[PDB]
């Protein structure tokens, strides 16, 4: 099959899909659209929502987590039965929540930069609610010494990686009391296929 | 298996799961917890996030959409292959977005009532972005005369129903230019198993 990823020149909400493609060794068109060009087409497209995954130059699927789950099931980075999928999903959705609240500090619902302390406090609260739960949740398998699903890396571990990259640039110390999360992120970034993708990827501020 | 749904006395983020249980004819413990009682246990529970689905008095899975997808796959109200699942997911996630922004007008991230115009405008924008896309998306199958996945009702149609109930109480006219969405909601509410559940369910303001 053929894949096209539509998004801005950001890591942002599409980065989970890029990591999935990189991990699976699957080539795709990585379409990075300038904001004003996207903005001028908005009222002319049946599907305007960003990011969006296009399959076989045909089917358009927006909603970043829906896109990621599809790539995960396709490439074998999701759960293998219903229970396992539920676990991969709640972990991933928890990290999406963090990323979503982070993005809401800077961007409106129409993708415009909003460049106040209230949004930052929502974000910081969202971290305090979620991260200790994720540290514990990770510990459920293999004492938390490996991945969220034991020895198989899945989209949950990738979400843990990409969702926290910006928060870590803003506050490099914020994961200091979640040592298992840090070793997992370090494990993901050194994983086969993932190391070279991450080291050769363009440097963007989001 | 055995099911327990934990949430407040609200329709809110858990209502998708209740509809799923009702549609599948599956009995569960519908646990409606008073807020202050939930609040007093918060720092004593490994999993404090609301809503939460408990399986066999054992596994705790929060994240309302993760919970719903699990019940949907279990009961047969999800897609039957990867592509179909991606379509059910983006539709459901679009409606979650609407519901999420609606809930953010009234509740903080710690479940407290925040009872300003800014949050309402985010919400209203989110409706304008999403609803026309959903009207069109529905039209992809069977001219939009049936359900999002043709003749099978899935969690996507249920989301379309429960996500808009409160917005419709606040503005009963807001779906007037999406006639296919309205006929779908009316189709869901008269569906077998769903009609009696909806007519006998407790009246709550959220
Ligand atoms: S760029 C801002 C808007 N995107 C989203 O909010 C997508 C949210 C999904 N939950 C996701 O992909 O995670 C956006 O695309 N606004 C423009 C529009 O036409 O919808
Ligand atoms: S009640 C407010 C918080 N709930 C959520 O935000 C859950 C969001 C998920 N995305 C979902 O289920 O849809 C909450 O539970 N805060 C308390 C806590 O301990 O996390």
Residue numbers in the entry:
A (entry chain A), B (entry chain A): 2 to 116, 125 to 215
What's the paper's own text on this?
We determined the crystal structure of the S-crystallin Q108F mutant at 2.35 Å resolution. Approximately 1600 Å2 of the surface area of each monomer is buried in the interface of this dimer, comparing to 1300 Å2 for the squid GST-σ16 with 38% sequence identity to S-crystallin. The reported crystal structures of GST-σ are in complex with either 1-(S-glutathionyl)-2,4-dinitrobenzene (GSDNB) or S-(3-iodobenzyl) glutathione (GSBzI). In contrast to the above, we observed the presence of a GSH molecule within the active site of S-crystallin, located between the N-domain (βA to α3) and C-domain (α4 to α10) of the protein. There is a disulfide-bond between the thiol group of the GSH and residue Cys112 of S-crystallin. In addition, there is a polar interaction network that consists of the glutamyl group of GSH interacting with residues Arg14, Gln64, Ser65 and Tyr97, the cysteinyl group of GSH interacting with residue Met51 and the glycinyl group of GSH interacting with residues His49 and Gly110. The two domains of S-crystallin are closer compared to those of GST-σ in complex with GSDNB; although the r.m.s distance between equivalent Cα atoms of the two structures is 1.3 Å. In contrast, the equivalent residues in S-crystallin are Leu100, Met104 and Gln108, respectively. These differences result in a collapsed pocket that may disfavor the binding of aromatic compounds.
Crystallins are soluble proteins in eye lenses that play an important role in the maintenance of lens transparency and optical clarity. Among the crystallins, S-crystallin in the cephalopod lens has been shown to have an amino acid sequence similar to that of glutathione S-transferase (GST), which catalyzes the conjugation of glutathione (GSH) to various endogenous and xenobiotic electrophilic compounds and is a major detoxification mechanism of biological systems. Among these proteins, “short-loop” S-crystallins (SL11, S4 and Cry9) are expressed less in the lens and are more GST-like, while “long-loop” S-crystallins are dominantly expressed in the lens and are enzymatically inactive. Overall, our findings have revealed a novel structure for the cephalopod S-crystallin and provided crucial evidence that greatly aids our understanding of the evolution of S-crystallin.
